[PDB]
Amino acid sequence: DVFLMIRRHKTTIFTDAKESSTVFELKRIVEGILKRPPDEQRLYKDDQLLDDGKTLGECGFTSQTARPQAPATVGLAFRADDTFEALCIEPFSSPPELPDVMK
């Protein structure tokens, strides 16, 4: 098992599957939630994109480095008409500064 958050723009999806599952299978799971197809979706780990045939483990996801409490981020970008859009992620809110009481 491996736990991850799939992110595009302001959207973020929490799910999981086998470390041995394929990037296409993950794309197919996105189709069950967001209703777009696998061939019109491009995934990514940080900056580098992913291959449909490789396992999530082969992509470097491992149970060790993508656990429930700290699930790994997976980039996502849609097929803009006759091309693909630039993978973009809206950052999360910024926390306040700590009060002096909490050192």
């Binding site: 929490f14 700290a70 809110s93």
Partner: protein
């Protein structure tokens, strides 16, 4: 259902498994939910805790630590009280 939607106070959309969101006793009371009081940096953590909690119920495995940064602790406390979890 299979999934549900949670929208932070600053608009971020978070989608989680149906039974994961049932961790929050407040959420169990009601496919989409808006949170005007809870920002995205806090609500993202609340989704992580759901993964954690469900994963480590009746656990043959050792339950690991759920790290919380001091900066979010105060807001996460208020949220976690809000959500009953």
């Amino acid at each position: 259902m299979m999934y549900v939607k949670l929208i932070s106070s600053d608009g971020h959309e978070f989608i989680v498994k149906r039974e994961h969101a049932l961790t929050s006793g407040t959420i169990k009371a009601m496919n989409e939910v808006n949170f005007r009081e809870i920002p995205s940096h806090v609500l993202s953590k609340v989704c992580m805790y759901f993964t954690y909690k469900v994963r480590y119920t009746n656990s043959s495995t050792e339950i690991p630590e759920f790290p919380i940064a001091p900066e979010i602790a105060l807001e996460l406390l208020m949220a976690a009280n809000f959500l009953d979890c």
